[PDB]
Symmetry: C3
Subunit: 158 residues, 3 copies
């Protein structure tokens, strides 16, 4: 009954000449997310929520933007290592919920695929993983398609 909650936030710039990879899904698009790793904004947000619930710090502490080993890193592999460290700390994951905010492209056709990727990576059934997709209703840099934002929440139990 020793439950804990975590929350996560991530954002990356949307630039030409990068792969667009969200929830481990490679999505056809003229632009992609800029970062040190594969820049998977959704997976990073979830990774942060998990480290946070376990009180193990954050993704920057565990997988630094200034370490060559993670240059172009597969964020699913990073998520699986996160889950491993959370389990090592003594916690089991109960559920994950998340939101993705993007003006474009359409993400609804890819949501189930993202959900399946996360569930596999966390060794969870599909019914304990949720991914929600939204636009920013034309507001701000997100409305101008300058970047894509992700949010996450995770429940664990020690």
């Amino acid at each position: 009954m020793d439950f804990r909650i975590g929350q996560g936030y991530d954002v990356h710039q949307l630039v030409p000449g990068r792969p667009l990879i969200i929830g481990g899904v490679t999505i056809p698009y003229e632009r992609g997310l800029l970062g040190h790793s594969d820049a998977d904004v959704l997976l990073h947000a979830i990774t942060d929520a998990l480290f946070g619930a376990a009180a193990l710090g954050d993704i920057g502490r565990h997988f630094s933007d200034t370490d060559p080993r993670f240059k172009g890193a597969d964020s699913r592999a990073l998520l699986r290592e996160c889950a491993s460290r959370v389990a090592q700390a003594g916690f089991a994951i109960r559920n994950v919920d998340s939101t993705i905010i993007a003006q474009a492209p359409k993400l609804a056709p890819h949501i189930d695929a993202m959900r399946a990727n996360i569930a596999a990576d966390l060794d969870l059934p599909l019914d304990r993983v949720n991914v929600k997709a939204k636009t920013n209703e034309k507001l701000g840099y997100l409305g101008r398609g300058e970047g894509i934002e992700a949010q996450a929440a995770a429940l664990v139990v020690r």
Copy 2:
């Protein structure tokens, strides 16, 4: 078997619309474009998220939809334990309308006032929210199977 969900919503403030937040009509020169009840939408998504049922976009006034959301959450074998939320609006003042929002939500979710919370914030005049171009709502929901 507890589960948590998180919700986010934002809508533009436009002329010629009534301002309805948490089912409360608030006297204001502009309203949300979408009834575009940003708060109820954020709570709805948090509940769908906790029950792992997807989102509003996949599922669908906003009170009728929240009542339906709560129905589908119950359908999946989940009971709602609590809701917490935040409204971010630079204008107008939300303080006098909070208690009514809470009452509306508690009624729609078949919950005691005890387990529903609504919080109000400005955006310190920063960004589009600060300039009164939109209103953002955030929500968190705990459920049990």
Copy 3:
């Protein structure tokens, strides 16, 4: 048991001429927040939220005193705090060096074991007012039980 969750948000403008205090920690920087401790307000708000006692505006000295009073009110409402998690979004300066001090400040104020308090740091990847260093945001989540 009777678990409840809360969430919190806070932002403050970042301008030269004021000190920078995040999580009860003064941080050397050319700008500060117009004590305006974004981290502690968000956590305070999350706690009132979980307890269903309203918000910081309804209830309320620097931000640590307010956090301390918040926790006393949560306790008397019949609730015990299980854990807190949070994120600070700030383009500059580097916050990672100061996380353990913040965690110590928050855990002391809430009378929690250190391993039940977490603080994360992000930049906004140069996007929006946050990414231009015009403001700093904090987010919080708190789990409580009655």
